[PDB]
């Protein structure tokens, strides 16, 4: 089984590397610095926005050593600190990248569902969770701290920055790490991105549908007041536009403005119902005519908002499943592989070929993901 | 098509020096390592140094330790090899060999090789 | 600094016939390979990694062994196959070969 394996795949790669490395470089750049432009006076997404691209900013910024070290066929020349400070570094600028993209989602989720958090504390909150998410990414990256180190590999004759592992339990050390890494980086992290976008899809969708429903009992309701001169009818249809633009009133963005007019001029032409003048109340539901008429304006904002945060969010979704998903599933059966679960050679042979294009895979995440966030 | 060519070779007086020239041309020569490899006069072969890609991992025989001195030129594509204090007993056929495959301890790709006449 | 012992040293062989060249180590070895060199030109890998066949060497050529025992087969002998056998050893640098095998054509 055991044979060389085709090693003229990793031609390309420090091509590669170096084209993520100026793209995503130079679109990190202009996000940092326009943050340093409008600063952003006391908010929370755009701290989220900042923080973000910043480590997306170093990621991209340690690739170059990285596609160097592709260049030499995994022969490290720079020692055995810069290993240490810059491997410890990518993996910290990773799970800083993760953790702060998850962290965005719960921020998006809360100020969907609800509005109510709309004030200056949250970024003095932010002021805190800014230095746990970098706590929990050192913390995380800790293991690769430990051992990430250089190992002279004579078989290659390469000098080579590994993990370096305890060889008598190397194996369990590896498939180990291997899982922290998935459980860490990919599954918690898609729990909560992944409610969190149901949530908002729920929210929103059945918001809309809602919204839909009782603006039509409201065109209803006036048209039956239109045409129908009856004691108790004229009420009650008052009644129904009432309750139905009480319904409808949940819609935070001038919104306020109209709905909340809207239910005024509902009030005052049923006080002119309870006292028995219905010519008036009708001229009143004419003029309830010229409101709504002269309001459909922001009630087409609303869809088009619909569409383009539920685009938003499908878009963030998709995009972290489609890149950081190959990655985490060759870390996984090869974390396989390394408890002897899986000892076909073919296979272990293409994990270790497919492995450096997923890394490039989730840096094109941290590539594109100022480009889906900030634009 | 990979070719190797050595270079350098001659007569030198023992004590004295020489520099070897192996030139490189056919595939990315700053990929993978490279060995010396010679052979005496009606003798077998012997393996003398091997240099890494980035130079970080170097190895001399041991009848060559202490003299010979192996570099590598990525950006010109040459290696190089600094003999000093020659003796009698490195009268041989030197050849720069590769793998063509990250540096593993072996020789599929030799070149031409230079003969060394080292006498008074 | 293994030292490696070929026999035999030299040997004939007719075409049609199956040839053996025995490679045995002082110290135990992790991978053997074989090269194959005429008089005149340089050498040319047969054998990599103990009993793999290196590309464009024919069928015929087989290497096996292991731990202080290795050796090279030719199934069946051709008369492009009459030149020089070494083998070389690797478990630890620095890297050693063996004095030689000269295979000639009987006749």
């Known amino acids: 089984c055991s044979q060389k394996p085709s090693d003229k795949h990793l031609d390309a790669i420090p091509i590669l590397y170096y084209i993520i490395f100026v793209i995503g470089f130079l679109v990190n750049i202009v996000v940092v610095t326009l943050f340093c432009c409008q600063k952003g006076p006391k908010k929370v997404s755009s701290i989220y926005i900042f923080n973000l691209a910043v480590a997306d900013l170093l990621l991209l910024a340690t690739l170059p050593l990285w596609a160097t070290y592709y260049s030499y066929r995994y022969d490290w020349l720079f020692g055995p600190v810069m290993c240490k400070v810059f491997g410890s570094f990518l993996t910290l600028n990773m799970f800083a990248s993760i953790f702060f993209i998850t962290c965005m989602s719960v921020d998006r989720y809360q100020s969907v569902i609800y509005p109510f958090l709309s004030q200056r504390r949250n970024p003095w909150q932010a002021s805190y969770i800014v230095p746990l998410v970098w706590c929990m990414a050192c913390l995380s990256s800790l293991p690769t701290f430990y051992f990430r180190d250089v190992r002279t590999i004579e078989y290659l004759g390469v000098n080579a920055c590994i993990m370096a592992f305890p060889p008598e339990k190397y194996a369990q050390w590896s498939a180990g790490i291997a899982l922290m890494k998935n459980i860490l980086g990919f599954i918690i992290p898609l729990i909560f991105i992944a409610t969190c976008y149901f949530g908002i899809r729920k929210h929103l969708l059945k918001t809309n549908a809602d919204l839909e429903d009782n603006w039509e009992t409201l065109n209803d309701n006036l048209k039956v007041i239109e045409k129908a001169d009856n004691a108790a009818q004229v009420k009650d249809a008052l009644t129904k536009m009432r309750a139905a633009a009480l319904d409808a009133q949940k819609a935070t963005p001038d919104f306020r403005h109209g709905f909340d007019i809207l239910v005024g001029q509902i009030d005052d032409a049923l006080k002119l119902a309870n006292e028995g003048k219905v010519k008036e109340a009708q001229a009143a539901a004419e003029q309830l005519k010229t409101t709504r008429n002269a309001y459909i304006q922001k009630y087409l904002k609303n869809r088009i908002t619909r569409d383009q945060v539920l685009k938003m969010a499908a878009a963030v979704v998709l995009a972290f499943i489609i890149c950081w998903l190959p990655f985490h599933v060759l870390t996984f059966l090869d974390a396989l592989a390394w408890m002897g679960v899986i000892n076909s050679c073919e296979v272990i042979a293409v994990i270790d070929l497919a492995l450096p294009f997923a890394i490039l895979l989730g840096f094109t995440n941290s590539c594109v993901n100022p480009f889906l966030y900030c634009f | 098509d990979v070719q190797l060519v050595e270079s350098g070779g001659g007569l030198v007086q023992p004590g004295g020096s020489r520099k070897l020239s192996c030139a490189a041309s056919?595939?990315?020569?700053?990929?993978?390592?490279m060995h010396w490899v010679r052979q005496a006069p009606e003798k077998g072969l012997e393996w003398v140094a091997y240099?890494?890609?980035?130079?970080?991992?170097?190895y001399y025989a041991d009848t060559v330790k202490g003299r010979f001195t192996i570099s590598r030129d990525n950006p010109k594509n040459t290696l190089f090899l600094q003999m000093t204090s020659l003796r009698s007993e490195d009268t041989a056929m030197y050849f720069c060999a590769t793998s063509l495959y990250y540096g593993t301890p072996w020789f599929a790709y030799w070149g031409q090789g230079t003969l060394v006449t080292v006498s008074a | 600094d293994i030292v490696l012992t070929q026999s035999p040293a030299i040997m004939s062989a007719s075409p049609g016939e199956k040839v053996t060249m025995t490679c045995s180590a002082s110290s135990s070895v992790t991978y053997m390979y074989w090269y194959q060199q005429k008089p005149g030109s340089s050498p040319r890998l047969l054998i990599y990694d103990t009993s793999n066949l290196a590309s464009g060497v024919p069928v015929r050529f087989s290497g096996s062994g292991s731990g202080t025992s290795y050796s090279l087969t030719i199934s069946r002998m051709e008369a492009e196959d009459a030149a020089t056998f070494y083998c070389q050893q690797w478990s630890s640098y620095p890297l050693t070969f063996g004095a030689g095998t000269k295979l000639e054509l009987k006749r």
């Open positions: 056919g595939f990315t020569f700053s990929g993978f390592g």
């Open positions: 240099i890494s890609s980035g130079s970080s991992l170097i």
